[PDB]
Amino acid sequence: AVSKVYARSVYDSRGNPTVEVELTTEKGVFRSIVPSGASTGVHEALEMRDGDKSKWMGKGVLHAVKNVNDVIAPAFVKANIDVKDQKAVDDFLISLDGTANKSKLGANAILGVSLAASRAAAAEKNVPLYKHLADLSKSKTSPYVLPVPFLNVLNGGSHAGGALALQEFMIAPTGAKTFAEALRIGSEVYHNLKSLTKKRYGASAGNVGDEGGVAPNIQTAEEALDLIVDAIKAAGHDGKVKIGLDCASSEFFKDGKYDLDFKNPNSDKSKWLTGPQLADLYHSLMKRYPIVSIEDPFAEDDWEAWSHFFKTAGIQIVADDLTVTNPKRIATAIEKKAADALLLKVNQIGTLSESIKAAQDSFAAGWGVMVSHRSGETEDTFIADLVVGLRTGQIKTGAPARSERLAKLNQLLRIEEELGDNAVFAGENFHHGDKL
Amino acid sequence: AVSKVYARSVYDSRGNPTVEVELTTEKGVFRSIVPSGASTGVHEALEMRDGDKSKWMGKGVLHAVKNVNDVIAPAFVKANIDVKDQKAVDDFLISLDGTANKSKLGANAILGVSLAASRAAAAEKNVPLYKHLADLSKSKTSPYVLPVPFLNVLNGGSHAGGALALQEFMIAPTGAKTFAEALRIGSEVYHNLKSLTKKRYGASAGNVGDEGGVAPNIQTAEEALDLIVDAIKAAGHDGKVKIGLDCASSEFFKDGKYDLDFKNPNSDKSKWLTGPQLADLYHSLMKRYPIVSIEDPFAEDDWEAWSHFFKTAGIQIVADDLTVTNPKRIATAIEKKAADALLLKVNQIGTLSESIKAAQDSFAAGWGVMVSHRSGETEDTFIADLVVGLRTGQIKTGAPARSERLAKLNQLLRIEEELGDNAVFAGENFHHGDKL
Ligand SMILES: O=C(O)[C@@H](CO)OP(=O)(O)O
Ligand SMILES: [Li+]
Numbered sequence: 052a053v054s055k056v057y058a059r060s061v062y063d064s065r066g067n068p069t070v071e072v073e074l075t076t077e078k079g080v081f082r083s084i085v086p087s088g089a090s091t092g093v094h095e096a097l098e099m100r101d102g103d104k105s106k107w108m109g110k111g112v113l114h115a116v117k118n119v120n121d122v123i124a125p126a127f128v129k130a131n132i133d134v135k136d137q138k139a140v141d142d143f144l145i146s147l148d149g150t151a152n153k154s155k156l157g158a159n160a161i162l163g164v165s166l167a168a169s170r171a172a173a174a175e176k177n178v179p180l181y182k183h184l185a186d187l188s189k190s191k192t193s194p195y196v197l198p199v200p201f202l203n204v205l206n207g208g209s210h211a212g213g214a215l216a217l218q219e220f221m222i223a224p225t226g227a228k229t230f231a232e233a234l235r236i237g238s239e240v241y242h243n244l245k246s247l248t249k250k251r252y253g254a255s256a257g258n259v260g261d262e263g264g265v266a267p268n269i270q271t272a273e274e275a276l277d278l279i280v281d282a283i284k285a286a287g288h289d290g291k292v293k294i295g296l297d298c299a300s301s302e303f304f305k306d307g308k309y310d311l312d313f314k315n316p317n318s319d320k321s322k323w324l325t326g327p328q329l330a331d332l333y334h335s336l337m338k339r340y341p342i343v344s345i346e347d348p349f350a351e352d353d354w355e356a357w358s359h360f361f362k363t364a365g366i367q368i369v370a371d372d373l374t375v376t377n378p379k380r381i382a383t384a385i386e387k388k389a390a391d392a393l394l395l396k397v398n399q400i401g402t403l404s405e406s407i408k409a410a411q412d413s414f415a416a417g418w419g420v421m422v423s424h425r426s427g428e429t430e431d432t433f434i435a436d437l438v439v440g441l442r443t444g445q446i447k448t449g450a451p452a453r454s455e456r457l458a459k460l461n462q463l464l465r466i467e468e469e470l471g472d473n474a475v476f477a478g479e480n481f482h483h484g485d486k487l
Numbered sequence: 488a489v490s491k492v493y494a495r496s497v498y499d500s501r502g503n504p505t506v507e508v509e510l511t512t513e514k515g516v517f518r519s520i521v522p523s524g525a526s527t528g529v530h531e532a533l534e535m536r537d538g539d540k541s542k543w544m545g546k547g548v549l550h551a552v553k554n555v556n557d558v559i560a561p562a563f564v565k566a567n568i569d570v571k572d573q574k575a576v577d578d579f580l581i582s583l584d585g586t587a588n589k590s591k592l593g594a595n596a597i598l599g600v601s602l603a604a605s606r607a608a609a610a611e612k613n614v615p616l617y618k619h620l621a622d623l624s625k626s627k628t629s630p631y632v633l634p635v636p637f638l639n640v641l642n643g644g645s646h647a648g649g650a651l652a653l654q655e656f657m658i659a660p661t662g663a664k665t666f667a668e669a670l671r672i673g674s675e676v677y678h679n680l681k682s683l684t685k686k687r688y689g690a691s692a693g694n695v696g697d698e699g700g701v702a703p704n705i706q707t708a709e710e711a712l713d714l715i716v717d718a719i720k721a722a723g724h725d726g727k728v729k730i731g732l733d734c735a736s737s738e739f740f741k742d743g744k745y746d747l748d749f750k751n752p753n754s755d756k757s758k759w760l761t762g763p764q765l766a767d768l769y770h771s772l773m774k775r776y777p778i779v780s781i782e783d784p785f786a787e788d789d790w791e792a793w794s795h796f797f798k799t800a801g802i803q804i805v806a807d808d809l810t811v812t813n814p815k816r817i818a819t820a821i822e823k824k825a826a827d828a829l830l831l832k833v834n835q836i837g838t839l840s841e842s843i844k845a846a847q848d849s850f851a852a853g854w855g856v857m858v859s860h861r862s863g864e865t866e867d868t869f870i871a872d873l874v875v876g877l878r879t880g881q882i883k884t885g886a887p888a889r890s891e892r893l894a895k896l897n898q899l900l901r902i903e904e905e906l907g908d909n910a911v912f913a914g915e916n917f918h919h920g921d922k923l
């Protein structure tokens with residue numbers, strides 16, 4: 052039934068080129084757009100780029116697109132595979148590549164064929180994308196779990212210009228009773244946060260980073276958190292709102308040491324914190340603010356710091372760069388007892404099937420799953436359907452600003468409204484939304 | 488036939504609530520998302536907001552949403568209107584309302600039904616939306632015309648904190664041979680510019696405002712002009728990319744005159760200018776810089792100074808607030824010989840048919856039409872189709888950053904590819920793409 056597969060270059064939300072995949076069947080054209088990260092883990096599957104310095108400063112994707120059109124397509128189409136059989140779909144792409152890392156076709160050629168096939172299959176079956184995804188991953192669907200949105204309000208690190216080391220600062224409305232309410236609450240806080248920011252930091256401070264958070268030239272985490280809690284308080288939602296962090300530590304890991312005083316190609320062989328040192332600081336913030344989740348408190352391969360901290364934290368601990376949505380890296384973390392939550396990113400692994408298995412291996416181990424965008428997003432809303440399909444009860448898809456973020460949030464409002472009484476907001480149970 | 492009309496509240500690119508309409512026919516479900524400006528003209532059709540300071544700070548659209556659902560919907564459906572008949576659909580909507588400014592139901596309640604029916608009409612005819620918009624318009628279609636994108640790169644005035652009072656600085660890759668090459672050019676300059684800006688003004692200077700352009704504290708118009716032309720040269724595109732300006736003059740129109748330092752605040756009176764005065768700075772800049780378009784050079788009623796200037800400007804002169812997409816203010820302008828191009832903002836008028844007559848009246852008078860976005864945009868790509876539909880040869884939909892701006896531009900890529908040989912890139916002939 053798949054009668055053609057085709058790629059083209061489109062733009063991500065930064066302006067860089069990205070791959071879009073269109074798959075045609077008797078029921079129509081299904082389109083998928085691949086995201087792109089800034090803060091990418093060493094162990095991510097390969098994103099292929101042209102490297103032609105004239106064009107796009109070397110960032111074009113014309114090779115990945117060619118791979119789609121010249122390599123996968125002809126062969127995908129001749130295998131006449133059932134799109135409803137996601138496994139067989141992916142097994143097929145995976146062996147065309149024939150590498151551990153998708154370094155021969157590029158994760159960015161494969162994913163879009165993966166993802167567009169799930170769309171084409173939902174269509175054959177006359178069901179909503181999230182219903183099919185539930186099928187595939189074998190999730191419970193009575194009721195369906197509406198996720199708590201982890202909205203990135205204050206952007207730091209690699210996501211924005213200025214001093215701030217911690218990359219993301221999030222607010223989580225776990226006290227809302229519905230998704231429409233959690234979004235209403237979250238945007239109210241955000242408009243207050245913005246207003247406070249310009250009052251205190253000047254107009255400029257008010258502009259946004261890549262994920263739609265404001266980016267003041269703040270030096271410490273405490274300053275950032277104080278501001279945010281003034282904003283929650285100001286919006287009148289004290290108590291209904293919690294905090295989550297993404298330290299993106301890996302980006303500032305140097306020897307068994309951690310550099311907070313940076314993005315600053317000279318200051319100081321002594322801001323530099325050791326792991327216990329850093330654990331310690333986390334435990335400070337923790338006693339002071341309503342933090343309920345910390346993601347990547349330690350670098351990608353500093354296994355020992357993770358375990359050490361994990362013993363005392365008593366809050367959700369998300370693995371992003373540590374695990375890169377890879378079942379093999381996930382097994383080690385479960386074993387080293389490093390984390391308790393997986394940051395799910397379909398483009399870190401490269402296929403839907405490998406991304407579902409990662410989620411099933413985490414849930415199996417007693418872990419949460421937070422589906423996340425990439426910092427370089429698109430108009431594509433796949434992940435909105437995926438988080439509901441997977442029953443995770445938690446998503447990270449940006450600030451309530453910039454439509455590559457609101458496109459997912461707007462998709463969640465419609466799904467909510469659709470499921471009516473057969474849905475539940477994760478709320479304070481976000482950590483284990485699968486087990487609701 | 489239309490079986491249901493339904494509306495809901497979704498969010499815009501700023502995180503403010505807006506209206507989404509869904510129109511059901513035998514062909515499927517057609518939706519619209521209405522944008523929302525920040526700028527405005529006093530004479531604009533009225534957007535209905537709730538004014539509930541307890542929700543969204545008074546910015547809810549629940550009332551507009553209820554107008555659709557409870558007032559329009561029943562009646563629209565009972566009327567059994569031919570959706571291919573746009574005038575009929577809109578005549579209907581205008582009568583339902585009964586006020587000259589759509590203030591009974593609200594231009595946001597109306598626009599949604601209006602745009603959604605054009606999508607449902609296109610489907611029944613089995614043509615892409617642009618082709619049906621061609622139909623409605625009475626536009627030439629051999630070839631079709633792809634527009635020159637006016638890309639916002641840098642903001643001043645109220646968008647930013649130095650002393651600069653002029654509002655948007657845009658680049659226009661006129662020199663390009665296709666849309667695809669013009670967007671590539673456009674985004675290489677954008678990136679260069681963000682580099683320059685962080686080197687010359689600091690890392691925080693790279694954070695973006697509402698429409699994706701940077702906003703560094705600049706002192707003078709020249710300072711801004713020079714940074715732009717350096718960026719053009721750094722990129723290697725010298726000679727192919729022009730400059731467009733949005734003055735948003737009203738902003739510093741201190742009754743008597745034009746307060747440059749409106750941002751003052753110790754407001755240097757008497758040193759406030761009069762048309763003929765401002766007109767000379769304009770002229771001065773035009774001689775030093777490759778400006779090709781100037782928007783809202785004088786305030787929305789200061790008709791006096793528009794004519795005055797128009798006499799010898801010799802470049803495209805765009806009417807935004809002065810006209811507000813109203814066939815009443817266009818006539819005056821045309822009659823006054825104030826400007827030669829209309830910025831077209833559908834939600835300024837409230838219906839698709841009124842937007843088309845307005846563009847039709849401009850073209851009649853020999854003016855150009857720059858279809859345009861609003862600051863509060865959505866993932867909807869309606870204006871992509873509309874610009875190719877009307878054959879205007881120029882659009883303004885923001886920087887190549889943030890996907891409520893790239894959605895439109897990505898959508899013109901797909902279009903250009905779909906027309907193949909049936910299309911042409913406006914290039915240098917942008918002021919008159921209709922007569923191409
Ligand atoms: O670090 C991260 O979790 C992500 C998402 O906010 O950023 P990036 O896509 O750039 O890795
Ligand atoms: Li990351």
Ligand SMILES: [Mg+2]
Binds near residue numbers: 297299346347371394
């Ligand atoms: Mg992360």
Ligand SMILES: [Mg+2]
Binds near residue numbers: 735807
């Ligand atoms: Mg304007």
